[PDB]
Amino acid sequence: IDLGRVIGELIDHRKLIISITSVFTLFAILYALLATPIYETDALIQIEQSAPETALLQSRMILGKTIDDLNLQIQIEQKYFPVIGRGLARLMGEKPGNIDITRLYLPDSDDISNNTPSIILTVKDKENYSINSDGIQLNGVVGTLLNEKGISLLVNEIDAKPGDQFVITQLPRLKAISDLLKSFSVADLGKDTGMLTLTLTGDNPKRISHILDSISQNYLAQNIARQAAQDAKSLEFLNQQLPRAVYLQLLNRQQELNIAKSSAIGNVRIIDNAVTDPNPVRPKKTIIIVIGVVLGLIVSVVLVLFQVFLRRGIESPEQLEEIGINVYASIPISEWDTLLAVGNPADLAVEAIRGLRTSLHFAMMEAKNNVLMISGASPSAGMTFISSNLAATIAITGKKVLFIDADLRKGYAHKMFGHKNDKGLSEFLSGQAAAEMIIDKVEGGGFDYIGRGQIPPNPAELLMHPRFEQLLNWASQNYDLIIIDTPPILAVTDAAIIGRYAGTCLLVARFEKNTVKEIDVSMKRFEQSGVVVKGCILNGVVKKASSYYRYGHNHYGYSYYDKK
Amino acid sequence: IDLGRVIGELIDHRKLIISITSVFTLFAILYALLATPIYETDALIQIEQSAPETALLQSRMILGKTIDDLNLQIQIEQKYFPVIGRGLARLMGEKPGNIDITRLYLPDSDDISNNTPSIILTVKDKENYSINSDGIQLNGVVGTLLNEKGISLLVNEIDAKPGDQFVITQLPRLKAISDLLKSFSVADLGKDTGMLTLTLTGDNPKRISHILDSISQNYLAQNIARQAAQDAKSLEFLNQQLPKVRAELDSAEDKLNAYRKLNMEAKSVLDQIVNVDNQLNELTFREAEVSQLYTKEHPTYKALMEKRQTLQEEKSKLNKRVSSMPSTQQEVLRLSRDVESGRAVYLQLLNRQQELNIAKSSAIGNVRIIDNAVTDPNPVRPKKTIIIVIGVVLGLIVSVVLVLFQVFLRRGIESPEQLEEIGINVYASIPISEWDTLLAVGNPADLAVEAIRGLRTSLHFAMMEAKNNVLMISGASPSAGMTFISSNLAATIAITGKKVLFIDADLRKGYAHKMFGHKNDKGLSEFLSGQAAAEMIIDKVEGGGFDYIGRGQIPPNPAELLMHPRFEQLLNWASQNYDLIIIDTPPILAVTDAAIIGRYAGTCLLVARFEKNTVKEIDVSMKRFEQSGVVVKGCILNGVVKKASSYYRYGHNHYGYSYYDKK
Amino acid sequence: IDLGRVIGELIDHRKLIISITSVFTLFAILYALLATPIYETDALIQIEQSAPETALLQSRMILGKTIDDLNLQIQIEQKYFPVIGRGLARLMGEKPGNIDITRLYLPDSDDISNNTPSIILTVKDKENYSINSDGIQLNGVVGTLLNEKGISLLVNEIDAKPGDQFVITQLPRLKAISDLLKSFSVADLGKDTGMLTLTLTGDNPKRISHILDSISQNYLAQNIAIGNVRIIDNAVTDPNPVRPKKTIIIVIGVVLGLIVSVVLVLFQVFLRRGIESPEQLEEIGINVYASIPISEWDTLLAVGNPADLAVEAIRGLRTSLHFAMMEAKNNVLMISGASPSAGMTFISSNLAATIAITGKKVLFIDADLRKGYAHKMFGHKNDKGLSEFLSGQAAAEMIIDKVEGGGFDYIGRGQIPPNPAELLMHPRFEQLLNWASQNYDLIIIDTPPILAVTDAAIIGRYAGTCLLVARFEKNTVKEIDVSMKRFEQSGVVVKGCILNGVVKKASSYYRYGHNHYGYSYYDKK
Ligand SMILES: Nc1ncnc2c1ncn2[C@@H]1O[C@H](COP(=O)(O)OP(=O)(O)O)[C@@H](O)[C@H]1O
Ligand SMILES: Nc1ncnc2c1ncn2[C@@H]1O[C@H](COP(=O)(O)OP(=O)(O)O)[C@@H](O)[C@H]1O
Ligand SMILES: Nc1ncnc2c1ncn2[C@@H]1O[C@H](COP(=O)(O)OP(=O)(O)O)[C@@H](O)[C@H]1O
Ligand SMILES: [Mg+2]
Ligand SMILES: [Mg+2]
Ligand SMILES: [Mg+2]
């Protein structure tokens, strides 16, 4: 493989590549837009150390005091039925409803797993609301507390629109601490300074600044507690030890400890109170979409790289001719029960069949008889398409052509030509029809045809009857050319029986469906039965850039008409 | 090998790959779900260093104090008969039963290996229960202590359902410490700070938090005493009490020497009385440090008063057992008690003195527990995601190496191309017929019969220019399809209006008579041995169209019968009354019968089984025929199956297409 | 070589591989079970440094004080006669007997080498015992000390069963210290802390804890006279032995046994030169007319077991010869080979039996005048064989005899002549063959091997067809090529070869496509 090969493969699979890449980018964009934005607030703490102060800030003693102050064990979440309802509601400009709850006591089920009891609050108006834990409906009003069914709830200042639901969870105190501790981080920012950079992340920009302020003030009040107790403990015992010169001497120590007790701030100073950065830190939309593009491309490339190395079908007539198989024509796919040579004579596929008609006039000379058998390797390779249209292009040249549908198994040529289905080839071979009663004329054609008749139970044994050679010997005197349509050779043996009485035999190879070895196996199965295959007809060729770079030619053909 | 080859091999072995991978993932999922979840509790300790404090926390002095406080030497395990009964019971939502035991003294077998005596407690109801150590059934009730059969047990607050069993083990004090020390870890978390992060893991989430609180508190109590230990009279007391008790102990030791210079019941009560005394003596020192650093109404102090009351009732029942014993034993027991309890009290005072000195050294001042132990409700083990992911990946690499081995190890034929590389003409490739019947008769539209018809037309062109109309069909190995092909080839040539004779010349294992319907008498054997005429051995296949000659009775000399001149006379006679004679023969690599018969056959074809036969096996067969003057025209590949590997390695899988109008 | 080759070799040598691996694993398991378990006790010492304290703990001053306190110079070992008697006694559940000795003074031989005098104490009962140092028997009792023959011994509390012996050694004080110092280790465990982790290993779990307690207390009492050293954890023994590590021993036993089995198989594969398939002979241009398998079944195989797999292969040779022996000068077939015991007499005598049942008159001539035993195999009137005919003292009619369960006549070798190669050169031998070639349809001549003697090259002049028998693995391809060219050099044209003694091998199925053994084909009834 080289540059031209891979570039042709990328050009051919451009629909697959573009679709997979666009799907990946669409998923990345939908995630970047629907993911909940997570903000970050920060505060600065200054200390003379700061390594033991970091572990004390992240302790359940300091953090647990914040959970109690702000009631962080009362989890309230806007109710959205899908996993994307929250993101799209944000895109529609809907402001998220928030309700302020100051007292919440659930019945505390505390079962095997659900240690977090939950209720659902449905806003009815600005003042009153509803509650349903397990179907039990309870009506509540802002202000007046509710103590019913073992459920205590106090909702203040419902700021939402009617109909909105909210999941109200009472998570345990440790779970509230573990959630806060997971989003709360402490750093030093100088590794030597007495400066602590407390950061906190969360989906609510105002709430996380109130939490980080509570953590700072609780750690601040706590810090004074360590030492203001020390200077109070000295003052405590000094006030306990006061018994006159010593009394005045201790009276000086009395005030010296009254003054040092109050000025608690010393070791720890809060340089900046918590403010929230309005730009969310997550999701990082650019890196998500960029990864979506790059991941979509490398996936599209490996899929194309696999389909290229895995495909075995024919890509050009050159592959067949490397083995020594004469390819007499390459018929393109006709994008246009009709005969193509009759419905659209100017079709690009009919122009390729005319090139086969002239190639055969030179190849069918020096043959035993004027009988041409057309077979192939696999079914639906185009044997009936080519033979029936080849017969139509030879009929317009003024020749008497007979098309024999010797596919006694799945032949449908009678349906394609208009049929008096009675008395086909089967009825003749079984002896219940004369040769004159089976020949019929194609209406918009110009050649006669013999249909297959009724499907016999022994198609391969009927073709071995001496009547079949009698029909061909009779028809070879009343027609200039007999074209015999046959089943595929790798399916059944009918074509190897018929090919004994045909002077010329051509195989039809489907463009990408058949393999080169599949066509070589077919030609050698004919030769083993005494049938000499003159050559091959590549059918169903499509325009591909990979063929133009791998080989010099894509073998599709040019359109040549005056446009009017 | 290339991409197409390996991908075709993966497509062909997709059942094996999927099954092995699914088995590995199933085992990984069953482990992740049935493994006992192990939780982790942590605490934070503030140190005013912390490197010597780490080794003191993990010491048997600190940890041993926790084992005594929480009775961690009483191991209780829910009884589950299988190794998975515990995991599945957790999945079924069954809450694990737990029983609270405050006093346990087993008879202490202490045999060669089992230093951990065990009993089995079967819950009968909320109040009473049963006990069976070695079959001895004992009924017990919550509350009232049990002192029977040398087994002391006090079960409080049975929280379980009736029928549940529990294994109650009394493991030694060091084993209880070693188990705790194995799950207990200490870290610094700053490497410079005075912060210690004590972690503890275990299957019980509530228990490990009580243990880590006990480990922290004993430590906290120790350095608080360090401040008050200097001026404490306790030091001077032990400085005086220890020599006194030593003199008393020495006096007891001297007396024991006097009386000395194994009654199963008298000896068993001896250890139990000492065991009660040691706990009572240790409880005395325990009440001292608890009544000072804690309060009386504190639940910890209340337990000791109850536990002391329990032991006093235990000794009281023990004292009555002593008074009921003979004086010959009562003499030695009182003397043995004064020594055993003498040595124990002496040991306690030594540890009391030893522990007291350490507190003074404690360069630490105030000790503060910033954070008390709480359990993380999410188990740390088993890590289900990494277990299942490894189960998938391990299952895939195992499936791949097995497929990679079977590919490099297989030698059988994969396509007719392999035979034709050697110069062997393959006249047909017969697929496996998935459908004592003749396939060409039972299912004429079969894909295998369509391939045999292609052989019929290939033979009509290959059997011309032959010496006679006799066709011998042999092969390399048995069960390669020689009888399947020859009998069905004869059926497809019989429908074409030809007179066919099928001779079953497999005088060893021929069963064609069973396949055609038989008058088993007068087969080929009876003709060759001279006891039958040629006309009496030919029989007609019922649903066939050709005559056949069965093998007859199995002769003792099959290869020597075929050498008789009668066999060539039969073929010369049959070659005039039939258009084709098909001779079924044994395999050539088994016996030589086919090389004898092949002398009189104008055409000889070998049948090669698709994957069972090798290319060299068929080449050896063709050259063994040629060495005996038999020219093998070609080969028939039989039993072909659809394989994606053939489509990528070669261009064609050689299976064939189905061609019928579906109606 | 490739994957199939090595896998076939592993399948063929599976008995050798399995046996060697199982022997290695058995030795590893016996070591892991019979090795004495060695326990480990540890203590914790608090130091107020600790680097100079480590060298003071391991000093002969501190350790020597423990030897004196616990009498560690009195070595007592349970007596077990083998090197495994101790391990197996532990497996049988026998608790090891122990005797407490508080005073021991041996006569202190102190000769050139044995600085450690020893005695043997045999327990008689719970109270009294016996002593024998160099045969001198002395009876002792627990309690009362013994001072006799210059031997002081005081045994207290014999805890054993009668009949048990004990080796009581009085090793020198330095040897007792060196043994303790070897098993005693000190560590810091923090490299900065004042914590010392004293560990001690030994076979006795209770004794090593008493020793480590003595070492701690002696180092403690010595340090006070760094200030107040403290003993945090007194010595306790870990009940799980640290050695032997059974899992790593057995695992190494498996892995070592496998790599040994593989290198032995790898050597036997690269070292073997014998024939492996008839393909090796046919690469040189030698026609192999048959491959006879080993018959696992003085009898004729073609007669005793006609349905044998080897007789079925000889029948294939019979039909291959009917086509190869045509266009020959005469009906005489000479069968020779390269090496002795290659199967020349087995094949020729059985080939004659399979051709005799086809109704032909066959004569089997045993022309091995050196080691021919065909007369023993057919039933013999040993007089008047081929030797007596060639030497002129027998007529051609008096030497032919009939095989009883056979169907062919045979001529035995007769008495072993002193000149076997010179007798066969007599013109009488060609007269016998010319006479027998008119009264028989086939004459089969059994001959000695050509690479041993030249008799077959003399006989092969009068035989129309000559076949060599090659033994399957015993003969080499060059050995058979040397044989065929030694015949051609003497004017004998060898038609082909017969590979004999083939065995079923997976390596042949992977190296070549075929193992050449053959299939069994009978109706099982
Ligand atoms: N080159 C082609 N262009 C357009 N249509 C084609 C071409 N070849 C085949 N076809 C169509 O695909 C189908 C298969 O053709 P058919 O003659 O039935 O195959 P076969 O006889 O080989 O089994 C037909 O409907 C035919 O119209
Ligand atoms: N191509 C095939 N498809 C289906 N079945 C087959 C095929 N070939 C053989 N068999 C079956 O496998 C068995 C072996 O056939 P058989 O004639 O007895 O083997 P052989 O004579 O070579 O020893 C038969 O039962 C036959 O029906
Ligand atoms: N293929 C075989 N199967 C079983 N036994 C055999 C085979 N070949 C030889 N033997 C036995 O091994 C021995 C050697 O045979 P022999 O004729 O004495 O060798 P040679 O004449 O070549 O020196 C004989 O006892 C024979 O029975
Ligand atoms: Mg068609
Ligand atoms: Mg058969
Ligand atoms: Mg011999």
Side-chain angles (χ1 to χ4, degrees), chain A residues 331-335 340 349 378-386 407 412 485-486 488 510 539-541, chain B residues 659:
Chain A
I331 317 298
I333 281 292
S334 172
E335 75 297 334
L340 175 68
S378 55
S380 65
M383 308 172 301
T384 299
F385 167 84
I386 279 182
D407 188 355
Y412 65 87
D485 192 20
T486 56
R510 188 49 100 103
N539 181 44
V541 182
Chain B
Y659 203 75

Side-chain angles (χ1 to χ4, degrees), chain B residues 47-106:
Chain B
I47 293 302
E48 279 53 37
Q49 302 80 1
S50 70
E53 304 301 324
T54 297
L56 188 66
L57 269 156
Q58 305 178 359
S59 63
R60 297 187 293 268
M61 179 188 61
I62 291 300
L63 296 184
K65 201 182 309 173
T66 300
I67 270 69
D68 304 335
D69 294 4
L70 302 175
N71 300 276
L72 301 188
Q73 77 285 344
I74 302 174
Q75 185 178 198
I76 305 173
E77 291 186 354
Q78 248 279 23
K79 182 67 171 184
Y80 301 108
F81 61 98
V83 308
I84 65 177
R86 182 178 183 179
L88 53 89
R90 178 182 68 259
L91 302 178
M92 300 177 182
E94 298 186 0
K95 49 181 300 301
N98 59 327
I99 51 183
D100 177 67
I101 293 182
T102 56
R103 183 66 182 95
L104 169 70
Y105 176 84
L106 292 189

Side-chain angles (χ1 to χ4, degrees), chain C residues 292-295 310 339-346 373 446-447 471 500-501:
Chain C
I292 317 298
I294 281 292
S295 172
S339 55
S341 65
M344 308 172 301
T345 299
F346 167 84
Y373 66 87
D446 191 20
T447 56
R471 188 49 100 103
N500 181 44

Side-chain angles (χ1 to χ4, degrees), chain B residues 144-299:
Chain B
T144 70
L145 184 143
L146 274 71
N147 269 6
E148 298 82 4
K149 209 68 176 182
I151 299 180
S152 179
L153 181 53
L154 171 53
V155 185
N156 305 29
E157 194 185 2
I158 292 187
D159 298 353
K161 54 184 180 181
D164 292 3
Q165 301 184 345
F166 295 88
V167 185
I168 303 174
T169 309
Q170 183 192 252
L171 63 165
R173 192 172 180 272
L174 171 61
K175 190 55 176 55
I177 296 173
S178 179
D179 290 335
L180 178 56
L181 178 58
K182 179 174 53 57
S183 58
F184 173 66
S185 65
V186 183
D188 213 328
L189 183 133
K191 200 180 180 179
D192 68 321
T193 73
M195 298 302 177
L196 290 177
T197 300
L198 320 184
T199 62
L200 181 66
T201 60
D203 51 323
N204 198 337
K206 286 186 175 59
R207 179 185 186 85
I208 61 172
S209 63
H210 291 156
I211 298 178
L212 195 56
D213 281 333
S214 179
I215 295 177
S216 302
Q217 289 182 5
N218 292 166
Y219 185 90
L220 178 65
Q222 220 186 358
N223 300 24
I224 280 190
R226 296 157 164 199
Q227 300 176 1
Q230 304 285 353
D231 46 355
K233 300 294 184 177
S234 181
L235 178 68
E236 186 64 29
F237 165 74
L238 292 179
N239 297 325
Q240 305 172 1
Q241 184 69 18
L242 183 62
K244 302 169 186 178
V245 182
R246 179 54 196 269
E248 305 161 359
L249 183 271
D250 297 353
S251 305
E253 292 185 338
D254 301 358
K255 290 179 297 182
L256 295 174
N257 308 327
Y259 296 87
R260 293 175 177 181
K261 305 302 178 180
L262 283 184
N263 176 272
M264 300 306 300
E265 185 182 358
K267 196 269 178 181
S268 299
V269 304
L270 172 60
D271 305 0
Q272 184 171 351
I273 300 162
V274 177
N275 181 82
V276 180
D277 299 355
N278 296 14
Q279 300 195 60
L280 279 170
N281 295 316
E282 288 186 6
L283 199 50
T284 305
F285 302 95
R286 187 64 196 185
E287 294 179 359
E289 300 183 358
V290 171
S291 55
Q292 304 302 325
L293 304 174
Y294 295 86
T295 66
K296 176 178 180 179
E297 77 285 0
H298 194 278

